[model samples]
Target: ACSKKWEYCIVPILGFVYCCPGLICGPFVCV
Candidate 1:
């Protein structure tokens, strides 16, 4: 769902990176 977005989503971004617990950076992007 996130791979194809007109706007980015944060929770999924965390899921994408499996980032540290309680961490968040929704404004960031990945390619």
Candidate 2:
């Protein structure tokens, strides 16, 4: 319930973070 809801929110953020290039560590952690 709560876990699934959080995943939905976080997955897109991870995608954006991975592509944004603003966070040096975001891509490394996401990929």
Candidate 3:
């Protein structure tokens, strides 16, 4: 349960960050 939950959300958001360049400016809001 926990693994799947983390996998789904983490990957998508990580990809989102990869595609964007605002993460370094908003660390807390990104990761």
Candidate 4:
């Protein structure tokens, strides 16, 4: 299971935008 604390963002803080490809920001938030 993916217990990673991440969000499904359609758009990141990046200055560029791509198609069919996104990024995930995961930072240990729990045990």
Candidate 5:
């Protein structure tokens, strides 16, 4: 139960980290 909850919480974080460059590795499209 706790593991599932933790994983569920992590999915969105990873998604954001991967999708939003500003949120993770600085803007890729910025000049």
Candidate 6:
């Protein structure tokens, strides 16, 4: 239920992306 999901991302397309946990995010992309 953290941030509404196990993880969250803000983009889409044909492959790699970034994600994070909890309601607090960071200044950089996580993995």
Whose lDDT is greatest here? 1
lDDT of 2: 0.29
Q: How well is each residue in 1-31 modelled by candidate 2, as lDDT tens digits?
A: 1222112223344443222333232223422
Point to the candidate with the largest TM-score. Answer: 1
Better of 5 and 6 by lDDT: 6
List per-prediction Cα lDDT, in the order shown.
0.38, 0.29, 0.29, 0.32, 0.28, 0.37
Residue 29 error for model 3, in Å? 13
Q: How accurate is candidate 5 locally (lDDT)?
A: 0.28
Cα-lDDT of candidate 4: 0.32
Whole-model lDDT for model 1 versus the true structure?
Answer: 0.38
Q: How much does candidate 3 score in TM-score? A: 0.14
Q: After superposition, how far is residue 22 of candidate 4 from its true place, in Å?
A: 0.2
lDDT of each residue in 1-31, candidate 3, tens digit only: 2222112223344443331332221332332
lDDT of 5 by residue, 1-31 (tens): 1222112223343443232322322233211
Candidate 6 residue spans exceeding 4 A from truth: 1-12, 17-28
Greater TM-score among 1 and 5 belongs to 1
- TM-score for all predictions? 0.23, 0.13, 0.14, 0.16, 0.15, 0.17
Model 1 misplaced stretches (Cα beyond 4 Å): 1-15, 29-31
lDDT of 1 by residue, 1-31 (tens): 3332324435562355323344433554322
lDDT of 6 by residue, 1-31 (tens): 2232335534434634444343342332323
TM-score of candidate 6 on Cα atoms, chains taken together: 0.17
Steric clashes per prediction: 0, 0, 0, 0, 0, 0
